[PDB]
Nucleic acid binder design. Structure first.
Lengths: 319, 324, 319, 324
DNA sequence: ATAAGTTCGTATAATGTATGCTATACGAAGTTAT
DNA sequence: ATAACTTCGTATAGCATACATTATACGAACTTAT
DNA sequence: ATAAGTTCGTATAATGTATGCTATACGAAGTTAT
DNA sequence: ATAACTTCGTATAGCATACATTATACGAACTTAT
């Protein structure tokens, strides 16, 4: 009750670190949204009334937002309440059923959550075939990045977190990248992402022209200014936003500027090589169980999602 | 759980009824009618449902010789009616939990057989193809394209009915592709492409010359053909799934005759036969569990497995070892 | 309370079928035991007092019983109570900890739960090599049984439940045995246990000399009297106790009469071919995932248990 | 939870203390002492433990630079002390749950490294074997047999100490088998047999001529050797695991010298080194994950996996594809 | 007499963990246009 | 004196026993068609 | 001036589900017999 | 009349969306060393 809510909420703010910085950014972005919808209609934003939550989801739906975004708003509200020691909006038929209904009506009109434009071995080979010959710091960095992204399948944020001290060697001379935390795990054991001899070379070239290896505690990737001078750091990472820019720029290099549609995934992006690699592995005949360790997935669906038709019966028949 | 809460819960249900498929509602209504009539008959109250009363009903359903999976559907819908109304579910009562268990146990031990569609394999398509490709009959031509697009594709009945003519291409060689949509999962697919042979694509040509189905593209590929053998396209009505089940039943009668062995199910061919046979054929010629637990969108096994079980290729490692 | 207990217990007896006939036999055997220990010491057997349960387990321990048997007594008592709507003995430190302690002290003195003498391809081949030539009804039956036991790995009770109507054909001519319920599953889908061409023959010979195929609803296996005349039935199964006797007799045939030790597993028994087959599969190089479907196991431990050392390092070293 | 209930719970604990290993009790006592002293120091009550107080302690432990797995052990033992006394566990409080999470998150992001034993691979055994097989020294002879039975076998330290002379055979060729017992699981094993080479079995011969360890069979294979280089068998005392850890540390000093790089762990060889190296060697020559996630009784992976990770044979499918 | 069980009691080993929403099945009753 | 330990205590890496039931193991007492 | 970011907000895709008992680590303090 | 359906209702086989969070997608506003 009131005192208890102030304490539960307060207890949450104290140990903020317990959750991702991003969960907080969304908690707040959703609350900003809901509070706004609430003011305009003179309703109390907290605790939220199921019926109010319901008109809110319907209102997001009418704004033409994705089922996933609508489910994000409901999930943030649910967390605020549950962690508040209060009932969850989803705990009410009104909210439970409207969610189902919005999802159901949205899909049955098409809506499908999207996946990033793939970046496979071919694009890597072509891009490398062209960038290989550059002596520019930016280019050397960007090719090492793409190479690591394709080879390791790590998420951009995990790549930005790599520190020089995290790199080792196999004996065959292959670089070994030690991975601490991921979206799926936060352990002291952790992974050892290995690189192919060619990708190591690539990386090796970047560490060299950049002088990041200066401090072991330095981030593997950093800014590189117009003058071609890198700017190593053990406190600031190269933003995932910039990493996303590498993918976009590399795609703009080969295919030119993008549509005017305003759609997403017109060019490669942070997850392009993960999708792309996962795939390439399927074809090669790699074992799902294997395609899975590559991406660090403890399950089979995403994996399943990334490779398909979206044939065989035409040969039995065809003969 | 207070009748005012319940009344609010029931209005919630009706207000957001689009939360469920109409098939689901149909089943819910059906179970309630059955449950209500039995309560009347037996002098019990049907809402809310009392555990002892629901237990007596589940036994009544078993005594009726219904399938363990059917008794499940009943308890299931009841459980939802109460769960989504604010009352305790019947499944939450010891007596209801115990009886379902026993009943399940008793049935499996009387020989309870989970059935699956009678295969419609290539040997079947060829033979049918044999008795028909030479038929001038508008309905004979149409029913060929169908078994073609059902077998060549493993598409579901509710799925072929949906198909429009504005959904076909010509890809790789007078072949033809059918952009589908055999998913309804948001994080699945948008649609796919199913291709055809000299078998399929062709038959699917004669159906268009005679169906004159392509005159307008909003239309649907498959339409009804009246007694005079005249076609009637439509961008507004699709052939019923019942009608497609008919073409399968009709087709099996032509070869084997009068309804057979009892009043049982799957005595002939049904909507799923084509998908069942396509698989085994695909498993017989050893074709990876990709276009097997996949070709008919089964990103989810036992299915391709319950279908190819009696096959010899799926005999197991013991037979393989015993035989060297 | 009292009324509630009488009803919970009563509700259990009404739908007796909900559980295995064997669970009941043990519920009662344990209660008989506990009630006996209780009378001798003037204690109330129900509800059971943790401290009383504890001296009871210690008393079983002192009688030299197996940890597993002691855990069976505690588990039956726990079920009587839990299903009674009363606390479980194990819900008390006294009972919780004494169990741990008895287990701990028993193992640390050796104790290891045993597994049945294996019956592998070799024993099958030898036994068949000798029995093959018999024209006796008993022998033909017994060889078909052993063959099915080894080939299918089914538990004896599942084998006794096979009915003629359950048998089919693959096309290659191989027999297919449909399995309804197992210890691990009670479903309408169920399994299709296949037999090798040689084992089918064997079976085929038994169905023939026996005339069980007379009624489809007849049990595949039945008694066979001294006069050599089988005795088909669709109501009585050949007891699992007799099936166990086939294994023992076949072993006595080849190796003679058993020890005087009074130990278990001196000869083959109901589970001998399951262990034996599982094993043979390991060696063949069969995939655990495969060794697993054979036995119908939805997990990896038992499977793991049955094949081991209980070598490789002596070649690296040896060279 | 009433002090009379608690007092009964604590007597229950002491009465059936044999429910736990003495190592476990040692750790429990240790955590309590640490928790008690900090409560005193900070003016808090140590029993029962208050969530805010336990949260302040877990932060104190982190500020102390302890490993996330060590803070876990503390909370863990506290949670048990309270669980087995009838009081609510600290882990059951939002504040304690949240802080453990954060702390875990914060640590993994400072580079928290889970360490494993420094390998003691064949290259290591040969080289050591090289610098010693020619040593007359009683202790030099004994320490060879040991690294032999540790590497050739992957047996654990607490395990080789247990070994008796009445546990050896002669099997297949002057070899020798060591019936063990590397299990303590009731539904595991009774014991096993570990075999040896011309490498091992032999060294294990010279240790017996000089140790005169076999004079009586109740004795244990490995014994202490005093400063005069004289042996002292015993059917009653086994070499401490500390002593076996010593032979590993001593041995690495002989080759590399004075304790190295900081006060860190695994700077030299430790009891687990032999099992770590045996594996990689076994993985390097491509030897199935049987005598790999098995040879050292690991019916339970990540172990053989955390050990052979930097290896080239375990590089992954991406490297394999990128390299053709 | 007796082989070949059955039944039964105590003893001990072996094993999974689950649903609930939506489609097809099929006899039939209802509807159109030949 | 120190070598060679053992015992300690705190630190951390490596595992594996509790639920709830369902089944098999085996001697011995009883049952029936020969 | 400006390339090359950073930061930040709204929008939307992607993913696991967990511990707690027992062993080893290692510096050190304590114990024996050379 | 019936063929050829469609609509129904009860029976059953075949699937796949809810949690709780943590992450990426991308335009645009701002920041800094050149």
């Amino acid at each position: 009750t009131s005192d208890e809510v102030r304490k539960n909420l307060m207890d949450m703010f104290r140990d903020r670190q317990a959750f991702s910085e991003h969960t907080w950014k969304m908690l707040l972005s959703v609350c900003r949204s809901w509070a706004a919808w609430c003011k305009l209609n003179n309703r109390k934003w907290f605790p939220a009334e199921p019926e109010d939550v319901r008109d809110y989801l319907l209102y997001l739906q009418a704004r033409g937002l994705a089922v996933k975004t609508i489910q994000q708003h409901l999930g943030q509200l649910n967390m605020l309440h549950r962690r508040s020691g209060l009932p969850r909006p989803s705990d009410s038929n009104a909210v439970s059923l409207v969610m189902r209904r919005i999802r159901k009506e949205n899909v049955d009109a098409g809506e499908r959550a999207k996946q990033a434009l793939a970046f496979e071995r071919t694009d890597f080979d072509q891009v490398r075939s062209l960038m290989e010959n550059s002596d520019r710091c930016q280019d050397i960095r960007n090719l090492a990045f793409l190479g690591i992204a394709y080879n390791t399948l790590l998420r951009i944020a995990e790549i930005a977190r790599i520190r020089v001290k995290d790199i080792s060697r196999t004996d065959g001379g292959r670089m070994l990248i030690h991975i601490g935390r991921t979206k799926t795990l936060v352990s002291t054991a952790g992974v050892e992402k290995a690189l192919s001899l060619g990708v190591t070379k690539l990386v090796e070239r970047w560490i060299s022209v950049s002088g990041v290896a200066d401090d072991p505690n330095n981030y593997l990737f950093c800014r590189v200014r117009k003058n071609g001078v890198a700017a190593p750091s053990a406190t600031s990472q190269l933003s995932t936003r910039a990493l996303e820019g590498i993918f976009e720029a590399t795609h703009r290099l080969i295919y030119g500027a993008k549509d005017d549609s305003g759609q997403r995934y017109l060019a490669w992006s942070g997850h392009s090589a993960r999708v792309g690699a996962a795939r390439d592995m399927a074809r090669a005949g790699v074992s799902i169980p294997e395609i899975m360790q590559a991406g660090g997935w403890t399950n089979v669906n995403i994996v399943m999602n990334y490779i398909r038709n979206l044939g065989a019966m035409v040969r039995l028949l065809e003969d």
